[PDB]
């Protein structure tokens, strides 16, 4: 789904079809470089998504003082310290699942058990 | 006990009150209502202490809700809502992936790239800066020694008037490109709902002015009235004398 | 006169690129200085990765003498520095657009970008931080006959200096012949 | 330090050399390494020209082939004040810098940078090992242009207008097969053949 | 009169909405009195500053940008997103000037150098580390209020505010002298101005001992600041309300409206 | 606010726009040449009482 660029000249590659050999050949519209396509997938709309609750993590989230602290442990390092905080996505239907990030194992883990 | 910062005009104690406004030169986004053809917008106010009031509004508008995924922008003195790949090429970023690197930051995410792919297809036709700058945006004044629109005139617009912060002199188009890319980034975050709608009613995004700025404004404007009267009677002294 | 093209022998030259703080950049852009005198010393490692500047005592210690080199860009491509001297002295082609091509010589390729930073442990260093924080009917009838012989539409204002006479006398004399 | 290094504390420019110099800095905007002494069909002329109809402007090889074949004021005004050095800079960069080969196969269009042209200084080694200090004046950035048979503003406006709900993906390929607005190298090759 | 000197007034229009700023917002804390509003068609239009509330008069930013240049950023001219995937953008009054690799050292350095007094303390700074951003504000128009600083670490142990009994004893001695000032406490860094914009990097304590050690009424461990006194969120006439917790809020509203219409004495001359 | 506006921003608002010149060389050809008659007016330091 990614947007490849011509290695000779960093420009947006477009799909165009072979006339007789029946293959998608990503030809550059700037220069004459051409490349066959790995998959017949071209375009993808994705009208439904549920993604974005997790990321935005820096390696020193716990360096900020404002995050609360708890005593549930990381289930890799067993250290009782932690940093917990809710979803990083905000829709009007995002969940009350929580995200728990530790400093010792430096790992993200949740509290869902379904 | 009369600690009081007032003024004494005509035998009357007289005080001025603070005025407020939104802070200028700071990013906001709005979510306009569904039935309009615009959905997500942005704004920058401006003031540079404060020659000819330096208003210079800006907006970037967004179309459809669907298949009308396009991003046009408006600038003075352009009456047409200009698509933005034209602006990137005109400011001097030709290769397409570098416009994409100006806009987004993590190449691994892709939702912005499908957001921008119809806009690149809008910008598929014009492949040169002065050809992009050749788009008219007439709005006055009359053409000088031109052909249709002077590229010198368009570059004079982009230097002198647009974005009256980071520079207005001659040579910082890459700072302009980065600033616009950050603006497009935050607009796309508001459109894709990873980040939320901003608030107008928060306090720190407002400012409070006082007697300093008020006397500054009125003193500047009456000083300009003064200076135009100084230029008056200098043409009138065709005859004597230097009074 | 001379060749209009560019020199190419000085192209093959590695160039190191330095940024500089402002007080330093003022003393190192002195044209009253810069005659060939040696003003600092350098110390690299065998593996590199730490280069310090040993500034000589020409500065008189208002600034430090201990400085470090911050090689931000160790490998540099396509960066070329040139020089310029003014010259010794469908198919419409314009060979003269009043372009003034010069005796220009490409004289170096940048290979290493670096920077001299004032080593904060120096006592003269951070002193600069408080500095930065602190800061005649018959004859004239023949004469006018010559004047219309000289030019047909002679000016009335130009008639004034050619006469330098009473103008009422001149006006009466002008009306008798022509305009 | 043990002398494992090329110690040469700086010599400097002759001051009498130092008048009439302008020593700028050049950069190309491409990931691949470019060396013009290896690439260009020399002779190479550096000129400061306008760029209006530069695609329609003739190449130097085409010029050489053509040469071989031929052989009341209202008494009141105001100059609102402006900095003389800024005006001189504006009139200097009224035309930008362009270098190209004699063939016109590769051409490069320059532009001006104002962000860091003051603080830079040059450590260029000499043949003996000397390090002359040349204080830089301005830095210029060059990009390639018309390497790929660029299009026309008019028919570009007709594609921009809503004549098609979507323009053809290989419309540029169809125009190139028609042969309209070909490359500068192709035009120079056709002119040399003719 | 001492009420009427500190007044503020916005324009809106004729009718307006209601979630729009006719009613109060949570951002208003420590700055404007939540009781002293006028009544009748303009309630929530005019509003009245806090007691220690102070306004920003601006300071020119070029020593700050040159300082920032000297302590190391990449100026944007050679930025590339691939080779700098995670560095922090730097803003000064909504202007891009830098992207810089190491944010924490730069932030603590700017905070220590404001405390030592080589920067005008009106300047404000925010580390929104969640978005890898940094802000610098130095214009005229901001509102700020004092705070008590806290160092987390302590040789005596847990966590403590820096000011001690000897400093306030010296303040008492200078007051009854009839050479410390508020500024002469500010210069060595014991209080610190914090604007209306910063507080989201800051945890606040209500009382000087609210959780600082580790029937009348009913009442974390990572504080950095405590208020001088919780009573001083009020305004001018709101001070005069005796026991202002011990009533209902619209009574405070009519009291602040009423107190402007009181006679008595106004001056002595 | 008052003390700040009295101390600064007034010399700034003068020196921002104090320049005004009308230099009349000849305003036509010759007049031989005439001289570049620099009618120059500008404001320097300001004063308060
Ligand atoms: Zn290509
Ligand atoms: Zn673990």
Curated annotation (Swiss-Prot), chain A:
A Gene Ontology cellular-component term: nucleolus
Residues binding Zn(2+) 1: 6, 9, 28, 31
The keyword Chloroplast is assigned to this record: no
UniProt-recorded Gene Ontology molecular function terms: DNA-directed RNA polymerase activity; nucleic acid binding; zinc ion binding
Pfam family, one: Zn_ribbon_RPB9
Binding-site residues for Zn(2+) 2, renumbered to this chain: 74, 77, 102, 105
Name of the featured protein: DNA-directed RNA polymerase II subunit RPB9
Residue spans, zinc finger TFIIS-type: 70-110
Ranges annotated as C4-type zinc finger: 6-31
Location relative to the cell: Nucleus, Nucleolus
Organism encoding this protein: Saccharomyces cerevisiae (strain ATCC 204508 / S288c)
Subunit structure, interactors included: Component of the RNA polymerase II (Pol II) complex consisting of 12 subunits.
Function: DNA-dependent RNA polymerase catalyzes the transcription of DNA into RNA using the four ribonucleoside triphosphates as substrates. Component of RNA polymerase II which synthesizes mRNA precursors and many functional non-coding RNAs. Pol II is the central component of the basal RNA polymerase II transcription machinery. It is composed of mobile elements that move relative to each other. RPB9 is part of the upper jaw surrounding the central large cleft and thought to grab the incoming DNA template. Involved in the regulation of transcription elongation.
UniProt keyword annotation of Iron-sulfur present: no
Record-annotated disulphide pairs: none
Swiss-Prot record, chain C:
The protein, known as: Transcription initiation factor IIF subunit beta
Record family assignment: Belongs to the TFIIF beta subunit family.
Assembly with partners or alone: TFIIF is composed of three different subunits: TFG1/RAP74, TFG2/RAP30 and TAF14.
Membrane spanning stretches: none
Cited function: TFIIF is a general transcription initiation factor that binds to RNA polymerase II. Its functions include the recruitment of RNA polymerase II to the promoter bound DNA-TBP-TFIIB complex, decreasing the affinity of RNA polymerase II for non-specific DNA, allowing for the subsequent recruitment of TFIIE and TFIIH, and facilitating RNA polymerase II elongation.
Residues modified to Phosphoserine: 3
UniProt subcellular location: Nucleus
Additional observations: Present with 520 molecules/cell in log phase SD medium.
Curated annotation (Swiss-Prot), chain D:
Record has Iron as a keyword: no
Domain of life according to the entry: Eukaryota
Keyword DNA-binding assigned: yes
UniProt keyword list: DNA-binding, Nucleus, Phosphoprotein, Transcription, Transcription regulation
Molecular functions per Gene Ontology: DNA binding; protein phosphatase activator activity; RNA polymerase II general transcription initiation factor activity; TFIIF-class transcription factor complex binding
Principal location: nucleus
Annotated GO CC locations: nucleus; transcription factor TFIIF complex
PTM comment: Phosphorylated on Ser and other residues by TAF1 and casein kinase II-like kinases.
GO biological process: positive regulation of transcription elongation by RNA polymerase II; regulation of DNA-templated transcription; RNA polymerase II preinitiation complex assembly; transcription elongation by RNA polymerase II; transcription initiation at RNA polymerase II promoter; transcriptional start site selection at RNA polymerase II promoter
Annotated compartments: Nucleus
Family stated for the protein in its record: Belongs to the TFIIF alpha subunit family.
Job of this protein: TFIIF is a general transcription initiation factor that binds to RNA polymerase II. Its functions include the recruitment of RNA polymerase II to the promoter bound DNA-TBP-TFIIB complex, decreasing the affinity of RNA polymerase II for non-specific DNA, allowing for the subsequent recruitment of TFIIE and TFIIH, and facilitating RNA polymerase II elongation.
Misc remark: Present with 1920 molecules/cell in log phase SD medium.
Protein name: Transcription initiation factor IIF subunit alpha
Swiss-Prot record, chain F:
Function summary: DNA-dependent RNA polymerase catalyzes the transcription of DNA into RNA using the four ribonucleoside triphosphates as substrates. Second largest component of RNA polymerases II which synthesizes mRNA precursors and many functional non-coding RNAs. Proposed to contribute to the polymerase catalytic activity and forms the polymerase active center together with the largest subunit. Pol II is the central component of the basal RNA polymerase II transcription machinery.
Source organism per UniProt: Saccharomyces cerevisiae (strain ATCC 204508 / S288c)
Family: Belongs to the RNA polymerase beta chain family.
Subunit structure: Component of the RNA polymerase II (Pol II) complex consisting of 12 subunits.
Transmembrane regions: none
Misc. comment: The binding of ribonucleoside triphosphate to the RNA polymerase II transcribing complex probably involves a two-step mechanism. The initial binding seems to occur at the entry (E) site and involves a magnesium ion coordinated by three conserved aspartate residues of the two largest RNA Pol II subunits.
Protein's name in the database: DNA-directed RNA polymerase II subunit RPB2
UniProt gene name: RPB2
Location(s) in or outside the cell: Nucleus
């Amino acid at each position: 789904t990614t947007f490849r660029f011509c290695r000779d000249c960093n420009n947006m590659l477009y799909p165009r079809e072979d006339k007789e050999n029946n293959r998608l050949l990503f030809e550059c519209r700037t220069c004459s470089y051409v490349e066959e396509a790995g998959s017949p997938l071209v375009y993808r709309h994705e009208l439904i998504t549920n993604i974005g609750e997790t990321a935005g993590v820096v390696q020193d989230i716990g360096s900020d003082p404002t995050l609360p602290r708890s005593d549930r442990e990381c289930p890799k390092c067993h250290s009782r310290e932690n940093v917990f905080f809710q979803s990083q996505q905000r829709r009007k239907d995002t969940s009350m699942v929580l995200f728990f990030v530790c400093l010792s194992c430096s790992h993200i883990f949740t509290s869902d058990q379904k | 006990f009369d600690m009081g910062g007032y003024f004494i005009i005509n035998g009357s104690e007289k005080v001025l009150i603070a005025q407020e406004r939104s802070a200028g030169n700071i990013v906001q986004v709005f979510k306009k209502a569904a039935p309009s053809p615009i959905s997500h917008v942005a704004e920058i106010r401006s003031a540079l202490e404060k020659g000819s009031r330096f208003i210079s509004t800006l907006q970037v508008k967004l179309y459809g809700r669907s298949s009308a995924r396009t991003i046009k922008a408006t600038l003075p003195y352009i009456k047409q809502d200009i698509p933005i790949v034209i602006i990137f090429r005109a400011l001097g970023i030709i290769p397409d992936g570098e416009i994409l690197e100006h806009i987004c930051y993590d190449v691994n995410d892709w939702q912005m790239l499908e957001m921008l792919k119809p806009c690149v297809e809008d910008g598929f036709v014009i492949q040169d800066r002065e050809t992009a700058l050749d788009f008219i945006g007439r709005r006055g004044t009359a053409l000088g020694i031109k052909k249709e629109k002077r590229i010198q005139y368009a570059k004079d617009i982009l230097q002198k008037e647009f974005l009256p912060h980071i520079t207005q002199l001659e040579g910082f188009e890459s700072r302009k490109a980065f600033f616009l890319g950050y603006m497009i980034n935050r607009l796309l975050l508001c459109a894709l709902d990873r980040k939320d709608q901003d608030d107008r009613d928060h306090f720190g995004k407002k400012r409070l002015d006082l007697a300093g700025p008020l006397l500054a404004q009125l003193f500047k404007t009456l000083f300009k009235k003064l200076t135009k009267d100084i230029f008056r009677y200098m043409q009138r002294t065709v005859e004597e004398a230097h009074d | 006169e001379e060749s209009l093209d560019l020199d190419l022998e000085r192209s093959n030259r590695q160039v190191w690129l330095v940024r500089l703080p402002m007080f330093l950049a003022e003393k190192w852009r002195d044209r009253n200085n810069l005659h060939g005198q040696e003003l600092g010393k350098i110390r690299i490692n065998k593996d590199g990765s730490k280069i310090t500047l040993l500034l000589n005592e020409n500065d008189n210690d208002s600034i430090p003498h201990e400085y470090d080199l911050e090689l931000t860009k160790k490998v540099v491509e396509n960066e070329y520095v040139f020089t310029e001297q003014n010259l010794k002295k469908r198919d419409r082609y314009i060979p003269y657009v009043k372009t003034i091509p010069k005796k220009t010589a490409i004289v170096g390729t940048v290979c290493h970008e670096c920077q001299v930073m004032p080593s904060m442990n120096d006592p003269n260093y951070h002193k600069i931080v408080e500095q930065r924080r602190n800061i005649p009917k018959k004859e004239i009838l023949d004469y006018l006959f010559k004047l219309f012989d000289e030019y047909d539409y002679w000016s009335l204002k130009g008639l004034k200096e050619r006469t330098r006479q009473p103008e009422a006398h001149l006006k009466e004399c002008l009306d008798k012949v022509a305009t | 330090d043990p002398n494992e290094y090329n110690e040469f504390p700086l010599r400097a420019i002759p001051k009498e050399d130092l008048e009439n110099m302008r020593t700028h800095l050049l950069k190309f905007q491409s990931k691949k390494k470019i060396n013009p002494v290896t690439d260009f069909h020399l002779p190479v002329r550096l000129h400061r020209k306008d760029t209006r109809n530069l695609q329609f402007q003739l190449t130097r090889a085409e010029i050489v082939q053509r040469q071989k074949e031929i052989s009341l004021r209202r008494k009141t005004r105001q100059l609102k004040v402006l900095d003389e050095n800024a005006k001189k800079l504006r009139f200097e960069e009224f035309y930008p810098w362009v270098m190209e080969d004699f063939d016109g196969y590769n051409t490069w269009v320059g532009s001006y940078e104002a962000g860091n042209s003051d603080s830079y200084v040059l450590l260029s080694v000499e043949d003996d090992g000397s390090f002359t200090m040349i204080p830089a004046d301005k830095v210029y950035k060059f990009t390639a242009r018309n390497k790929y048979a660029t299009l026309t503003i008019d028919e570009a406006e007709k594609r921009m207008d809503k004549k098609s709900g979507e323009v053809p993906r290989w419309l540029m390929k169809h125009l190139d097969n028609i042969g309209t607005t070909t490359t500068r190298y192709d035009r120079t090759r056709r002119k040399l053949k003719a | 009169t001492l009420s009427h000197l500190r007044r503020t007034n916005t324009p809106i229009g004729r009718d307006g909405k209601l979630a729009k700023p006719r009613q109060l917002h949570n951002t208003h804390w420590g700055l404007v009195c939540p009781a002293e509003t006028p009544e009748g068609q303009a309630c929530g239009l005019v509003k009245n500053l806090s007691l220690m509330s102070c306004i920003s008069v601006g300071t020119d930013p070029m020593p700050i940008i040159t300082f920032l240049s000297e302590w190391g950023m990449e100026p944007l001219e050679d930025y590339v997103p691939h080779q700098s995937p995670d560095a922090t953008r730097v803003f000064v009054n909504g202007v891009w000037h830098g992207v810089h690799r190491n944010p924490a050292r730069l932030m603590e350095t700017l905070r220590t150098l404001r405390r030592k007094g080589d920067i005008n303390p009106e300047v404000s700074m925010i580390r929104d580390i969640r978005e890898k951003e940094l802000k610098i504000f130095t214009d005229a128009g901001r509102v700020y209020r004092p705070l008590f600083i806290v160092e987390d670490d302590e040789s005596l142990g847990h966590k403590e505010l820096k000011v001690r009994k000897g400093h306030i004893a010296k303040l008492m001695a200078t007051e009854y002298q009839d050479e410390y000032t508020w500024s002469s406490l500010l210069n060595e860094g014991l209080v610190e101005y914090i604007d209306a914009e910063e507080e989201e990097s800051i945890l606040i304590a209500m009382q000087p001992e609210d959780l600082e050690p580790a029937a009348k009424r009913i009442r974390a461990t990572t504080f950095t600041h405590c208020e001088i006194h919780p009573s001083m969120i009020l305004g001018v006439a709101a001070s005069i309300i005796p026991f202002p917790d011990h009533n209902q809020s619209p009574r405070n509203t009519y009291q602040s409206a009423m107190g402007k219409q009181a006679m008595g004495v106004f001056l002595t001359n | 606010s008052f003390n700040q506006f009295v101390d600064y921003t007034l010399q700034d608002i003068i020196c921002e726009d104090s320049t005004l010149i009308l230099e009349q060389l000849a305003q036509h050809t010759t007049e031989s040449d005439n001289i570049s008659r620099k009618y120059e007016i500008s404001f320097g330091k300001i004063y308060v009482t």
